[PDB]
Amino acid sequence: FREVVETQEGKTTIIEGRITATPKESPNPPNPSGQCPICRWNLKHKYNYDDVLLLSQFIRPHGGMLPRKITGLCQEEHRKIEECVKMAHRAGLLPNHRPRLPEGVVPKSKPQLNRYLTRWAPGSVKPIYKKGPRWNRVRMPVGSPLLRDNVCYSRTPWKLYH
Amino acid sequence: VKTLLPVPSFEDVSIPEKPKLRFIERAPLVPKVRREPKNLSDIRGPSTEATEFTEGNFAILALGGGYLHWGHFEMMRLTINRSMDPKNMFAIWRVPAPFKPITRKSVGHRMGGGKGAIDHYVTPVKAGRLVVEMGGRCEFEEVQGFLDQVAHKLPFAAKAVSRGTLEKMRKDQEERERNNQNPWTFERIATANMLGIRKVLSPYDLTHKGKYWGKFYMPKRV
Amino acid sequence: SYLPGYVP
Amino acid sequence: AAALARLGLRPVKQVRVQFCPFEKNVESTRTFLQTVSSEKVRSTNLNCSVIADVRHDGSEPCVDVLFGDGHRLIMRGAHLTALEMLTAFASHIRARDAAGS
Amino acid sequence: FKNKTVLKKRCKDCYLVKRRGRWYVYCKTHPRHKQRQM
Amino acid sequence: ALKDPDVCTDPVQLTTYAMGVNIYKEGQDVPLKPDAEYPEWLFEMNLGPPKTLEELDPESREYWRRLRKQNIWRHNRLSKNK
Amino acid sequence: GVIRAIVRAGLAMPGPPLGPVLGQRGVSINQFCKEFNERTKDIKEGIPLPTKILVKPDRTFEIKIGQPTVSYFLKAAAGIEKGARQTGKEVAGLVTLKHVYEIARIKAQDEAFALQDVPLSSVVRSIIGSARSLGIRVVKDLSSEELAAFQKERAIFLAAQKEADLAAQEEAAKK
Amino acid sequence: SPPSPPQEEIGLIRLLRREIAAVFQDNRMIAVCQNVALSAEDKLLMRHQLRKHKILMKVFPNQVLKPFLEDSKYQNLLPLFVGHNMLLVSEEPKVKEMVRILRTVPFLPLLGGCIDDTILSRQGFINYSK
Amino acid sequence: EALAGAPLDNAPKEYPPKIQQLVQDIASLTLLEISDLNELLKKTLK
RNA sequence: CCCAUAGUAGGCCUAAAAGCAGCCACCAAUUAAGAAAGCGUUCAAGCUCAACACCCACUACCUAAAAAAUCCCAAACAUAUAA
Ligand SMILES: [K+]
Ligand SMILES: [K+]
Ligand SMILES: [Mg+2]
Ligand SMILES: [Mg+2]
Ligand SMILES: [Mg+2]
Ligand SMILES: [Mg+2]
Ligand SMILES: [Mg+2]
Ligand SMILES: [Mg+2]
Ligand SMILES: [Mg+2]
Ligand SMILES: [Mg+2]
Ligand SMILES: [Zn+2]
């Protein structure tokens, strides 16, 4: 990985780029014929929002997702990981990948509400004052439809709307 | 070195003397006196006429049944004659002028008292029929803009097509019927009257095979 | 040390 | 070139780009020079000079920027992209311009 | 803004952006191109 | 009020001398030289219409100019309706 | 900025079309006609000359003059006073390849073709395309025997156009 | 996924190669410069000056000009061709006459060249001129 | 078949090897032989 | 993303018609760029697009909303092997 640093001495600014130790993919993949890191390790349809060890390898130090041309993912799995990272931040599973706070900012104390499987952003969601009749009920989304083909070990399929 | 490609030449195409769409009259030349029944089965089911191209290459396909009155013909005519280039394009009607009389009783009258008086005329249309056919020295992307604009204003589900897209549509539907993994189909069940299902079906369902419900056509049905 | 059907 | 032209090389006095063409790490510096040497940027401040001195000493490339205030900005482009070099270059333009006025 | 069910850009400077759960159209050049999803 | 200066009309004179070439008042008309003195490439030029695409050589710059010009014409037709 | 337009030699006018243009710039309009008329004095009056005006930040001008347009050269070389109304369907004039060669030997001295350092072949191949736009036809061999026959039949056509043209004018009055 | 089917080369490609070969073989002085974004006038005015002394200004694509060099004598000129570049070529080497025309624009760098089948840097062009 | 890259501007002058043989060969020859060579050279060069 | 010189204000019509009110042609310079696809100007200017160069934007072109009057309306749930 590359890093950039700025050192100011004598009212003169100098900018340099220095390489750093870079992690290497583990050897002997199970499926060398796979196209992206997911099928090469037989992980397709086998991860969820809570599998942070898998999700951390595809995000930046501040919680942002990495490009697809870098990771090598397929558009189908890059969208899944991009959505599972959104729900991991919201559930409090990535406390070391927080946004960068500019100098002179102290986040205010806000109601701590525990949550998981949060599809939508809290602030952009309005309350359901009218549930509606039984045949036209306004459901509450739970999870993500992108994870609907995931491996289910039960007879009841993933319910995405409560 | 961006690779350039050859282009089709339309020099071999001919343009008629009156490329624009002719005017359609509200009612036929001679007014009709004999009043007719509603005969709703003139817009029900697939069409057996004007399902193929004759002169042009682009057209508006009907995806549902309905009746066309004068107001519809004027919108199609003006919209097309305004947006098309008479020099390199031409258009023709694939539907006859309004001939089916529609009776209507006066306001405020109760049920009974005979039958109403002829109010206006319409043109029945079935699903799968071409409404307008265009052609000339033009690609499909050129006409597709205002043809879809026209198709959206029609009383039924319509869509602009070409000789290629229409063919592809039909071949893709046949492909779906062949590779369908479901062992149970509407045809097999209905024709064999399995489960006594013909007690809730219609005799037309033997031929429509579930792709039609009244005037509505369902292309996703195999 | 990974078989063809190994899943992390 | 477009993003840097809207700003303008008003505070700048001189700009110097040195690079070794045969070396395989000078694409960034040569791309930086391709924009600054545009007629859009150069026109904003004719007084502001832009110099390119080629070398073949096997040395690393650097961008030295002289300002009117007297401050200097140096960017070693061996491990920096054109966008990174341009971005940092613009931020200093805005800061030094505000200080002068 | 103007509530629209079919958003559409009216110039090159209009840009789509999803905010508060719905799509918007903003334009700094011509603020009359602004639209809200209905 | 502004008009093009009068042009002479005399077949014998027109073929003998080129009238428009000379522009100075004190100067004289330019008389046409015989065939031998003119260059060799001046009597093999394309007087007729442009050469169609099928007549040109694929391995020639004049072939791709025509093909690139036909695709510019196409991009214009498609965009006109938009 | 820069202003480029065609101005007749020795006939520069302080009024439009060129007058109002200089007004917006603020350059002296009278000075232009003074210097220009005195610089194109050697040139025959009424010849269109492409002019390129260089404007300084102090509303000071350095005029630039070019060689006459191709349309002038071609018309003169043919005798035609006015180009064709329709091209490809009627031939207004008729010139040789020798004229086209004497018109490129003087049109290649202008700023445009000279700065490109092109051969005379590239200029003659650009003048045959401008002749066609006029309707003029470029022929290899043209003797005065057939140049007086084509010139004689062209006047008949022009006479017919007058009658048809005048017929429309008379009909317009009746409307 | 199955390998993408090959495609016959375009005619223009096999035309540029024939022109490139002529450049390196016909004329002996070859100076590689960077086509900085000069105005179309300042780039036509300079090109006209370079013609007074019989110095041409050729431009070829780097994707067609790189392969021709990877398998050739001039295989060490390859790293120069990164970005907007152009060729200043002349049958006779008039380096001294080109340099003074290139000094008017301080931001136009003469990266390198190949004179008499000999590769050179910029400072070698400055000496061969002297 | 592949021309050598340019020498660094600060590196000491590394003269080409093909000429190193020519430099030595000239010393071995005798002045009278060098002189005869030279008379033909001067005329050939003109 | 990037970039734009030129025969030429093509001809005719027109008070004027300059790539863009109409009709005709739609050839040509330069490695490369429409006698001009969309704005614009009283006419011009002026801003884009298609071009070259650079090198991978290396997309989708299959669907777009919703409001009434006494008080929302079972409570709840995404992961332990089809009974
Ligand atoms: K409809
Ligand atoms: K016009
Ligand atoms: Mg060209
Ligand atoms: Mg004109
Ligand atoms: Mg015109
Ligand atoms: Mg313009
Ligand atoms: Mg206009
Ligand atoms: Mg032009
Ligand atoms: Mg046209
Ligand atoms: Mg472009
Ligand atoms: Zn806008």
Give the technique used to solve this structure: cryo-EM
Q: What distance lies between CA I40 and its chain's CA centroid?
A: 17
Q: Are E14 and E28 in contact (CB under 8 A)?
A: no
- The CATH number that applies at residue G3 is 3.30.1550.10
Q: What distance lies between CA H40 and its chain's CA centroid?
A: 19
- Looking at the fold, whether G50 and G6 belong to one and the same domain comes out as yes
Closest nucleotide to the alpha carbon of A159, via C1': J78
Of D81, D61, D79, give the one whose Cα is nearest residue A19: D79
With respect to residue G28, please indicate whether it lies within any of the assigned structural domains.
yes
Query: Per-residue DSSP letters for chain H?
Result: -PPPPP-PPPTTHHHHHHHHHHHHHH-SEEEEEE-----HHHHHHHHHHHHHTT-EEE---HHHHHHHHHTSS--SSGGG-SSSEEEEEESS--HHHHHHHHSS-TT--EEEEEETTEEE-HHHHHHHH-
Q: How far apart are CA G134 and CA G95, in angstroms?
A: 12
Q: What are residue B216's phi and psi, to 5 degrees? A: -95, 140
Beta-bridge mates of residue E4: E37
Q: How far apart are CA H25 and CA H117, in angstroms?
A: 9
The residue whose two tokens read 């369908």 is: B180
Q: Give the CA count within 13 Å in the CB-facing half-sphere of H3.
A: 3
Q: Is G69's CB less than 7 Å from nucleic acid strand J?
A: yes
- What strands lie across the sheet with G48-55, from one edge to the other? G2-8, G48-55, G61-65
Q: How far apart are CA I42 and CA A34, in angstroms?
A: 74
Assigned token pair, G125: 């191949």
List of residues 6+ apart from B159 with CB closer than 8 A? B60, B61, B63, B148, B151
Interface of F with G (CB under 8 A): 2-9, 11-12, 14-15, 18-21, 23-26, 30, 32-33, 38-39, 41-43, 45-47
Domain that holds residue G22: 1-66
Beta-bridge mates of residue G3: G53
List of residues 6+ apart from A4 with CB closer than 8 A? A15, A16, A17, D80, D84
With respect to residue G152, please indicate whether it lies within any of the assigned structural domains.
no
Distance A115 CA to J78 C1' (A): 13
Query: What's the domain count of chain H?
Result: 1
Selected residue of H24, H28, H32, H76 to mutate for chain I interface (largest I Cβ count, 10 A): H76
Query: Per-residue DSSP letters for chain G?
Result: -EEEEEEETT---SSTTHHHHHHHHT--HHHHHHHHHHHSSSBPTT-EEEEEEEE-TTS-EEEEE-PPPHHHHHHHHHT-SS--SSSSS----EEEHHHHHHHHHHHTTSHHHHHHT--HHHHHHHHHHHHHHHT-EEES---HHHHHHHHHHHHHHHHHHHHHHHHHHHHHHH-
Q: Are B114 and B94 in contact (CB under 8 A)?
A: no
Query: What's the domain count of chain G?
Result: 2
- Looking at the fold, whether G134 and G118 belong to one and the same domain comes out as yes
Q: What is the β-pairing status of strands A2-9 and A12-19?
A: antiparallel
Q: Is A142's CB less than 7 Å from nucleic acid strand J?
A: yes
Selected residue of F8, F16, F21 to mutate for chain G interface (largest G Cβ count, 10 A): F21
Of B39, B58, B68, give the one whose Cα is nearest residue B146: B58
Q: How far apart are CA A149 and CA A157, in angstroms?
A: 10
Closest nucleotide to the alpha carbon of G18, via C1': J44
Q: Give F38-54 as a 3 state SS string.
A: CCCHHHCCCCCCCCCHH
Q: Is chain I adjacent to chain D, meaning 3+ CB pairs within 8 angstroms? A: yes
**Domain boundary pick from G46, G66, G86:** G66
- Looking at the fold, whether G77 and G134 belong to one and the same domain comes out as yes
Query: What's the domain count of chain A?
Result: 1
Residue B180, CA distances (Å) to B166, B189, B220, B221, B222 in order: 21, 16, 12, 11, 8
**What is the identity of the amino acid at A160?**
L
Residue of F nearest to B137 (CA): F77
- F77: which DSSP letter? H
With respect to residue G166, please indicate whether it lies within any of the assigned structural domains.
no
Q: How far is the CA of F64 from the centre of ligand 10 (A)?
A: 19
Residue D2, CA distances (Å) to D7, D40, D42, F75 in order: 9, 8, 12, 27
Q: Which of residues 1-20 of B touch strand J (CB under 7 A)?
A: 1-2
Distance A79 CA to J77 C1' (A): 26
Residue of G nearest to F16 (CA): G144
User: DSSP alpha helices (H): ranges in B30-162?
Assistant: 70-83, 140-152
The H or E element spanning position F16 is helix F11-16
* Cis peptide, bond prior to residue G17, ω within 30 of zero: yes
Widest distance between CA atoms in chain B: 81
Q: What are residue E9's phi and psi, to 5 degrees? A: -80, 140
Assigned token pair, D96: 């030094």
Q: How far is the CA of G76 from the centre of ligand 9 (A)?
A: 28
G114 min Cα distance to partner chain H (Å): 9
With respect to residue G133, please indicate whether it lies within any of the assigned structural domains.
yes
Q: How far is the CA of G170 from the centre of ligand 5 (A)?
A: 28
Structural domain boundaries in chain B: 18-222
Q: What is the CA radius of gyration of chain H?
A: 16
CB of H57 less than 8 A from some CB of B: no
Beta-bridge mates of residue H87: H32, H58
Q: Which contacts (CB < 8 Å, 24+ apart) does range I9-16 have?
A: I9/D55, I9/D56, I9/D57, I9/H121, I9/H123, I10/D57
Assigned token pair, F44: 């093999």
- Looking at the fold, whether G42 and G105 belong to one and the same domain comes out as no
Domain that holds residue A96: 1-162
Burial B165-192 (b: 16+ CB within 10 A, else e): ebeeeeeeeeeeeeeeeeeeebeebbee
Residue of A nearest to C4 (CA): A30
User: By CB neighbour count within 10 A (0-12 exposed, 13-18 middle, 19+ buried), where does A55 fall?
Assistant: buried
- CB-contacted nucleotides of strand J (7 Å): 1-13, 16, 18, 23-38, 42-46, 48-55, 57-58, 60, 64-65, 68, 72-82
- Looking at the fold, whether G71 and G57 belong to one and the same domain comes out as no
Q: How far apart are CA B152 and CA B143, in angstroms?
A: 14
Q: Determine, for residues A17 and D92 on separate chains, whether the beta-carbon distance falls below 8 Å.
A: no
Q: Is G96's CB less than 7 Å from nucleic acid strand J?
A: no
Q: Are F20 and G72 in contact (CB under 8 A)?
A: yes
Domain that holds residue H31: 1-130
State the sign of the Cα–Cα–Cα–Cα dihedral H41, H42, H45, H47: negative
- Looking at the fold, whether G71 and G136 belong to one and the same domain comes out as yes
Q: Are A146 and A79 in contact (CB under 8 A)?
A: yes
Of H85, H105, F41, H55, give the one whose Cα is nearest residue G117: H55
Instruction: Return the nearest residue to J71, CA–C1'.
Output: A130
Chain D residues with beta carbon closer than 8 angstroms to that of H122: 54-56
Q: Are A68 and A75 in contact (CB under 8 A)?
A: yes
- E4: which DSSP letter? E
